[PDB]
Amino acid sequence: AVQKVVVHPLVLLSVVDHFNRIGKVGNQKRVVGVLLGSWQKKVLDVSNSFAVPFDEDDKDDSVWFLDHDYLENMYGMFKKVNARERIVGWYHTGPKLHKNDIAINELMKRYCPNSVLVIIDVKPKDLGLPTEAYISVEEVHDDGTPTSKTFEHVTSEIGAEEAEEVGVEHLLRDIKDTTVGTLSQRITNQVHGLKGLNSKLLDIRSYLEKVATGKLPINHQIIYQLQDVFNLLPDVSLQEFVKAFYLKTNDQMVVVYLASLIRSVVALHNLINNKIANRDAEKKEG
Amino acid sequence: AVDTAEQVYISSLALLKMLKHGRAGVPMEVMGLMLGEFVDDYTVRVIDVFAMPQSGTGVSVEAVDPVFQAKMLDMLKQTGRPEMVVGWYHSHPGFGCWLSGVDINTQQSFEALSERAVAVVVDPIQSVKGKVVIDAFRLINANMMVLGHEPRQTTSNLGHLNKPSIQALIHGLNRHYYSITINYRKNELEQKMLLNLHKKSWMEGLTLQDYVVKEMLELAKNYNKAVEEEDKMTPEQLAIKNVGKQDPKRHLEEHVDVLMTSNIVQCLAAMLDTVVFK
Amino acid sequence: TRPANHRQLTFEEIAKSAKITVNEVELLVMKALSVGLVKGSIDEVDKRVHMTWVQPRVLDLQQIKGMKDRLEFWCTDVKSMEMLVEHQAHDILT
Amino acid sequence: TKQYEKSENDLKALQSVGQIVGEVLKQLTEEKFIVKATNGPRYVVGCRRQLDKSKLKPGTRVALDMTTLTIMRYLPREVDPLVYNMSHEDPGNVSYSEIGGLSEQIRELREVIELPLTNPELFQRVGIIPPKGCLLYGPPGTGKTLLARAVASQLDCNFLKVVSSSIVDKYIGESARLIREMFNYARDHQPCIIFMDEIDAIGGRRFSEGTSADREIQR
Amino acid sequence: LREELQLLQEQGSYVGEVVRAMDKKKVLVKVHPEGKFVVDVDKNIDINDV
Amino acid sequence: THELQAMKDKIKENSEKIKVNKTLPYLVSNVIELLDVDPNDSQRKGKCAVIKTSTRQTYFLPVIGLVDAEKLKP
Amino acid sequence: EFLHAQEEVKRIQSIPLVIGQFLEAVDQNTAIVGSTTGSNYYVRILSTIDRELLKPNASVALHKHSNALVDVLPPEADSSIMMLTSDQKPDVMYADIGGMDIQKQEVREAVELPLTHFELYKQIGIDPPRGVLMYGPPGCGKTMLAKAVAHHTTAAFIRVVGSEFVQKYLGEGPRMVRDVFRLAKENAPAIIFIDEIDAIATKRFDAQTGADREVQRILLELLNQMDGFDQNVNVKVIMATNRADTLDPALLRPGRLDRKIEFPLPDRRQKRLIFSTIT
């Protein structure tokens, strides 16, 4: 079915520009619309969409309505201009999901066998690659609950297209690209420890909270399982590198050797040729 | 009577369907419609752009369905903003995006409907990322040849847009037409996330993910050694000697600075041992 | 249970815990290779059984406390020296 | 009932423009391929992500996109005239042996033509090769065509008929590749049989050197 | 080179063959696969080299 | 049972959309009938026939649409 | 910003591109290039590499609309059709003439030494010719000694009929025979075999035969290209024809083809030898 989704900045903006539409008139809830997907393969892609007036009451927390006269005839519009573009699901800006979201997908399953919902974010904050994606399946449960319909997270990734980077990538103009090979990889390293070890502390504090409160989630078992896959090397005191010690510097063996060999001859190219051309102009002029 | 140079405020949402709907018609030319509000004579804004059915038999003035707009405006009422129509646009991917013979026939028809009806063209081909490309024009009336034929006041917004002058046939259409200035009213809220969504997705996906060892340096040493002798024969070729050969010639680049950065790639990637671990 | 490694294991330790004779340690640890709990090949010169990967099972209250000891220890050690990478090398970047 | 709307949705697929065929030559790199359209221009273009490893090939006919000129899916070939050469039929067996003469000539192309298919092992074991060609002239009597014609479809339903009218073609005749095309589709039939009739026209002799029409005959 | 390429961008630029020269400054142009052309001035290099 | 006349109106209305596509059958194209299936790489099945053009160019288009493959040999 | 400008010029034109044929370098910053369609185009060269990969005659990629000069071939991707195919084996053993040693001594000096040898030539000063012309059939001869050389030595064999390069346009013709002879000087050792070029040797001025006369000037073009092999590296040109009466005098003239090898009429000698090989 649906494994991963591809969200373009163009269709994501179609949720963002509608945040100006109903944001000025208010009032409650969020921006919600129906998603037009482009499915060429198991990997899902999204090009365009259409935003529909939508509201969700608080009291009355289970009340939701799409406008389906907007959904029907406007489909024949986008279908007439683009035959490949069809509705794969819906979307909204979240930020989180209330329990009522179970009924939005099951209603529109007449349009698509499986409707994928995309939670987006109009204001970028944290922690990383934004928005979100969910898929609607039924896993029931191990405890014996009646059949449980819970949306499972779908990994979301941004993607590009021809001719769409004209105006999009133009307006920024302030970015330095990249530079690959010097700063590009090292800034990630400073962040790889930051973003790597912050979720380490956020989860290890919530995993300690388990014993305290919030149990379940037990989880189970996914938590410790892949944590023990992380445990191929801990790495703890001290590094257990006795076999990887001589191999540590042995990987730095040729990297330092070439860096010593290149800088020697690069100098011979830089130093000699500079002295030659310099004294040819300098002393022959005066 | 009084005519002042117009300034076009385009919304980042209206910029989407210009290139996107134009990409769907590639290679063939499409016909769209511009949506916006007329503030005054010297400024104009396009707040929305929508897609219109592409013509596989060629663009015509009847390609726009009036019941398509009448059903669209009604759907814009239940949508947040029901703004009145303004003008039209069309893609021209196959060439340098100039107004064709059909574009002038649909001018007097659209300029009768709406006052301005700015003619807007767009092309995918001229660039990819860092150029505005697109196009825009506005019909100056040929009946005005009896009157003064050189609008507009506040000139160089035209005059500067009259640069580069874009070859000949394009500005050959400057007879009976005059282009219009396109500036971006700030969407920067969306434009700030446009940079954040683009670069974060391009930074190692987590920034973590991405962060032929000696052999890649054995393949590099062929570029770091076997390339040296073909590079270091040139200073012996600079020795004539002396001097019958035409000079100067500079062979210093680009291999020297490439092997520099080649070590910059290999040194900081080897620092991943010291960086990631401890 | 242990942080290891301490990966390769001596046969006498298996002959202690599992209390199996030296001639039967082969069938023992190699059958686990087919079960899939450990892929580690066996070193038969010193007769020491080497381990690879691991099989996690369930969890205990002392396992979470044992986790925070040896898990966050990777977080506090790396980020401490990661600041050293940020400190000194921020001048050459700017 | 609803099958009509299905054909209406097929018209939406008819809105897609057709791509342009081309012949690949070789490859400079994985990102640069050299393709040549049937019209004769060559294009170094990029490729899209939906293709497979079978697209590369050693110069196999492919189709090029209408914009990026990238290869989508390769079509093997196309031939209009082939069907008119598919319909040739002759009887016998018996009707071939009923011609009354010459008696030994019926015993000739019987084992020469029809036999290789039913019993190829007889020739390869002894080591004798069957003849790769034959010539039947006349008319001291009749039977120049019929002798080879009846054994032509007696081998199998396989046959390919060639008329001398297709060789002359037109001014700057392109049938040079059609003689290759006609024989290409002759190999689509196995085992193949090739006819040539009335070669005294298209067999033009170079003894006395004439107009270049005699040269293109040799071509 | 970017600005100059825009001059050469549309059709590229061709190479002609002049069969005869005129004093009116119009020079006949001929491309090998195409037909003969002619154009008005067109004066760049000294005319004596043409 | 009367729904047959309801859909009969929309097929004639959409046949009028074919009329503007039927004016005019602008050019001659040599036909070659072909049947092939392409595994991907979900499954896409269909009949597609390689087409010619008398301009000496050759193109690739799905099987027509309108008149089916019943007529004729290429 | 200048390093960002380096990404600019490298961005242009990206894809797509079209092949074109370089003609000559007229001056700096620009050069003329013949299009694949045959129309010569005068294009500003790219500011990166103006010299080493230019070359007098080469196939250079051009942009679709702008036809911009960017990069040439390695060289080369070569061309269509194919080579080799003579390595299947067995054909004919050379031991038949092994008893003479008077015939092989002249053959041994005319085959393997002209293939690869260097210091022996400049010493004596004799410049070995590339010319091999085979006339005299019937009988067949010829291709027997062709695949027999394949037993002797191993080299790339270019096998094309004299009519193989005849096409509907006259712009592709000069490029094919150029791509055939430019791989001969590029790769060594190389042997090119064309069968019966006496066809295109027919001289007719008529416009409908203009392309037919265009391929005989192509024959005179590759004739101009065969002196580009002089000297000395590299090529081996073997020529075979059934009737040489239609050939031009300058084609058989020395300085290009200096050796005429006349295959003798079968007569009495080839009788008994040819009955033994079939039995």
Ligand SMILES: Nc1ncnc2c1ncn2[C@@H]1O[C@H](COP(=O)(O)OP(=O)(O)OP(=O)(O)O)[C@@H](O)[C@H]1O
């Ligand atoms: N022995 C025969 N038995 C039956 N019919 C025959 C016989 N010989 C000839 N025919 C008839 O004569 C017709 C022509 O036959 P065939 O091809 O042998 O002669 P042909 O080649 O046309 O004459 P020519 O050799 O002068 O060109 C056939 O249609 C066939 O029906």
Ligand SMILES: Nc1ncnc2c1ncn2[C@@H]1O[C@H](COP(=O)(O)OP(=O)(O)OP(=O)(O)O)[C@@H](O)[C@H]1O
């Ligand atoms: N021992 C032999 N002596 C003479 N000819 C032979 C011998 N063995 C094979 N051949 C013939 O040589 C032919 C191949 O020669 P090639 O391909 O050069 O054409 P060709 O004989 O030159 O054609 P043409 O005779 O019309 O010029 C084969 O058809 C084969 O029958």
Ligand SMILES: [Zn+2]
């Ligand atoms: Zn138009």
